[PDB]
Amino acid sequence: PPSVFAEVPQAQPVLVFKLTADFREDPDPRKVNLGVGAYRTDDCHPWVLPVVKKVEQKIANDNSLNHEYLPILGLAEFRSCASRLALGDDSPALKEKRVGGVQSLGGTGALRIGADFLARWYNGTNNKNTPVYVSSPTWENHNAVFSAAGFKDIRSYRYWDAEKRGLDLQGFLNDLENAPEFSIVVLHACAHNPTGIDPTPEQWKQIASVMKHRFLFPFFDSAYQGFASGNLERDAWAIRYFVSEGFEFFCAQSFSKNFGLYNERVGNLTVVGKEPESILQVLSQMEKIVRITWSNPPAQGARIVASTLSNPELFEEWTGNVKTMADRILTMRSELRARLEALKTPGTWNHITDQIGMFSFTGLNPKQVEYLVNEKHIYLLPSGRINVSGLTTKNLDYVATSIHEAVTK
Numbered sequence: 001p002p003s004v005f006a007e008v009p010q011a012q013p014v015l016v017f018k019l020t021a022d023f024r025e026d027p028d029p030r031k032v033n034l035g036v037g038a039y040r041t042d043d044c045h046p047w048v049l050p051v052v053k054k055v056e057q058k059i060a061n062d063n064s065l066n067h068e069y070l071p072i073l074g075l076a077e078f079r080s081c082a083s084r085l086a087l088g089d090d091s092p093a094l095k096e097k098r099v100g101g102v103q104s105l106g107g108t109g110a111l112r113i114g115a116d117f118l119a120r121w122y123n124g125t126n127n128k129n130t131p132v133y134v135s136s137p138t139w140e141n142h143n144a145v146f147s148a149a150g151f152k153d154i155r156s157y158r159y160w161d162a163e164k165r166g167l168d169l170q171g172f173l174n175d176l177e178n179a180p181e182f183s184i185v186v187l188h189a190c191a192h193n194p195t196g197i198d199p200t201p202e203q204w205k206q207i208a209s210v211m212k213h214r215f216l217f218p219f220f221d222s223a224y225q226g227f228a229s230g231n232l233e234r235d236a237w238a239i240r241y242f243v244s245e246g247f248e249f250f251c252a253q254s255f256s257k258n259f260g261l262y263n264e265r266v267g268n269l270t271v272v273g274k275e276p277e278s279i280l281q282v283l284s285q286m287e288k289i290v291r292i293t294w295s296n297p298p299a300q301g302a303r304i305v306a307s308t309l310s311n312p313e314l315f316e317e318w319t320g321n322v323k324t325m326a327d328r329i330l331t332m333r334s335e336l337r338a339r340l341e342a343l344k345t346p347g348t349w350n351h352i353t354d355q356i357g358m359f360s361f362t363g364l365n366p367k368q369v370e371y372l373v374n375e376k377h378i379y380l381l382p383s384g385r386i387n388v389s390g391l392t393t394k395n396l397d398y399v400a401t402s403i404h405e406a407v408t409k
């Protein structure tokens with residue numbers, strides 16, 4: 001009689017997922033949800049980018065388009081344009097033909113494929129022992145993805161200094177100095193998730209130095225290019241510096257946020273190598289991994305991105321749309337800080353504006369968060385992370401005052 005699945009454990013729900021359900025259930029009228037995982041407008045709505053609507057119309061009216069399998073690595077124009085976006089149009093890595101691009105299922109898919117490749121071809125053959133370094137507090141799914149790829153030794157580098165509400169550069173650099181040679185280091189290219197604190201360009205030069213000295217492999221996660229600061233070139237400054245300093249690396253790019261195309265699963269794994277012929281080989285093995293995962297990737301999202309990035313007018317319109325998003329986020333930061341200061345809230349609050357991108361470590365501790373959630377119906381994670389786009393001109397006063405109460409009490 002007993003089912004073949006009878007002993008399958010009910011998996012634990014994701015913290016963010018439970019939080020938002022608890023919010024929806026909750027009936028008090030002042031409630032705010034600062035744990036949503038995507039950009040929201042000043043009216044608490046999703047935002048389809050005008051350029052996306054425009055390009056979707058053009059796609060729908062282009063009768064030349066068929067539905068035949070894309071190549072295993074993906075739409076050629078999307079892969080070139082995507083890597084060009086990250087590396088910059090006059091990159092030497094590109095001029096010297098030592099850049100590969102694998103279209104992937106969002107940033108998550110690019111991390112996965114990259115991880116699978118490394119667990120098989122990097123630092124030897126099938127070396128699952130190579131240490132993988134991730135930022136202390138990091139995107140939850142970094143660990144899970146590298147574990148799924150087979151890596152058994154996943155480590156933390158120091159990053160968030162709760163005391164000083166900022167980057168522990170010395171901790172970070174120290175941990176990097178002690179890393180076994182050839183260890184993989186998962187770096188946030190900009191808009192650190194979930195803290196919002198990035199290294200400055202000068203701190204990046206120091207990070208790179210240690211990495212170069214200890215032959216560490218950079219695996220960049222670039223989920224926010226342009227969206228972070230409104231400035232595409234500045235958001236890619238670290239990536240381009242590592243290029244200029246001769247590094248070989250992977251960079252997992254997502255277009256979920258910067259195009260608002262979350263549900264079309266558009267990503268690209270950029271590969272930068274020393275010599276061209278070697279890159280051809282890497283791609284050849286990327287194909288094998290893709291084949292046993294998704295076979296080949298979906299077209300619609302990649303078509304939108306490719307059409308946009310290859311047309312200068314649409315490119316301009318898109319950068320405008322992105323700037324709208326980064327300007328709103330900047331503004332809500334500036335205003336949250338100004339209000340907390342005007343209420344003379346204990347502690348410093350410059351971290352709120354030193355941070356960049358949609359997510360902010362507020363610096364509240366778990367008891368303080370418990371107060372906001374339980375007493376004030378303001379929903380955020382124990383870590384004190386908020387989605388800054390969940391701040392609105394309507395709820396700002398209430399949130400600032402609630403945070404003042406929390407810190408004071």
Ligand SMILES: Cc1ncc(COP(=O)(O)O)c(C=O)c1O
Nearest residue numbers: 106107108139193221223254256
């Ligand atoms: C730092 C970082 N990397 C990668 C991703 C992957 O997202 P997606 O697979 O939707 O592109 C996210 C999503 O929030 C993120 O914050």
